[PDB]
Design a protein around this ligand. Structure first.
Ligand SMILES: N#Cc1c[nH]c(C(=O)Nc2ccc(C3CCNCC3)cc2C2=CCCCC2)n1
Length: 304
């Protein structure tokens, strides 16, 4: 029922990254501001219980006065106070993270004279899960390309981790493909029908339990290492060409016991053995035994 910002900046004891500030507690930085009516709406890309995302044309957006297609996030006109706060919080975090080639970047915002609108990159080929499902063989794509996708998502995640940013909803539905079929990770909950998505299970909240690390499920702890677990599930999605994780198994008491016992999905049909080894490493029960995203990146490179 509550919206529901997944991205989170955490505190940093070790690692190469140090957290000086909590961005949601300062901005909003006005350098992002964009004239409201230099936007013309188009088709609705998606919608849910809290808002929607619409394709649009932006007239003279960046420093180069150019026109381009963009995706505009926004809340229902019925949105309550807290949820507008959550939207501003997502805005502030995206602005704090900076730009990277394998995330869905912030391009601007309209915060004055009407409802808050968040302007982010338009990715022409849509989300990764759908694209996978349309490129199945009987029962276009290629093994090189799946390795490209895996690498590009790992790069985006290495970038987030370097900012001490946790995602907490890493999954194929949250990966987009843009020109050149380059993968970009983001969070598109706003555009999704969460209330009716069986992949999100009722708790406190609505949680993607099948993508979640053991320690997130039982201890409600979230670190970059827990994102690594989820990335392994994402890998399984890619190399199964878009099968639902744990096919046929419903989330209930027996599932929770399985994962806690050390159950791991079997090797996907289209996964090379060494890629499966990445998944297995990602699913180590002890969090400090999992790889980091940069170690995944270098292995995927060595394997290419
Ligand atoms: N929130 C958000 C956000 C940020 N960018 C986008 C975006 O670019 N989305 C899409 C762009 C193009 C297409 C095209 C439009 C029709 N042609 C096929 C792909 C589909 C989408 C999707 C919207 C909702 C989530 C799944 C992907 N959504």
């Amino acid at each position: 029922p509550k919206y529901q910002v997944r991205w989170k900046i955490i505190e940093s004891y070790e690692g190469n990254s140090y957290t000086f500030i909590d961005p949601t507690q300062l901005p909003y930085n006005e350098k992002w501001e964009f004239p409201r009516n230099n936007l013309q709406f188009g088709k609705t890309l998606g919608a849910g219980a809290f808002g929607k995302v619409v394709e649009a044309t932006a007239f003279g957006l960046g420093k180069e006065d150019a026109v381009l297609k963009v995706a505009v996030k926004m809340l229902k006109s019925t949105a309550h106070a807290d949820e507008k706060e959550a939207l501003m919080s997502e805005l502030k975090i995206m602005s704090h993270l900076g730009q990277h080639e394998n995330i869905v970047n912030l391009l601007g915002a309209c915060t004055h004279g009407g409802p808050v609108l968040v302007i982010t990159e338009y990715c022409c080929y849509g989300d990764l899960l759908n694209f996978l499902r349309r490129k199945r063989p009987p029962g276009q794509l290629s093994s090189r390309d799946l390795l490209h996708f895996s690498s590009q998502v790992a790069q985006g995640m290495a970038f987030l981790a370097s900012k001490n940013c946790i995602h907490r909803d890493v999954a194929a539905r949250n990966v987009l493909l843009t020109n050149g079929h380059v993968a970009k990770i983001g969070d598109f909950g706003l555009a999704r029908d969460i209330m009716n998505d069986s992949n999100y299970i009722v708790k406190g909240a609505r949680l993607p339990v099948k993508w979640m690390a053991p320690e997130s499920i039982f201890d409600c702890v979230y670190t970059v290492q827990s994102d690594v677990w989820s990335y392994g599930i994402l890998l399984w999605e890619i190399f199964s060409l878009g099968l639902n994780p744990y096919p046929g198994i419903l989330v209930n008491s027996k599932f929770y016991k399985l994962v806690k016992d050390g159950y791991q999905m079997a090797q996907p049909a289209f996964a090379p053995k060494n890629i499966y080894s990445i998944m297995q490493a990602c699913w180590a029960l002890e969090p400090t035994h999992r790889p980091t995203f940069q170690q995944i990146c270098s292995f995927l490179q060595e394997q290419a």
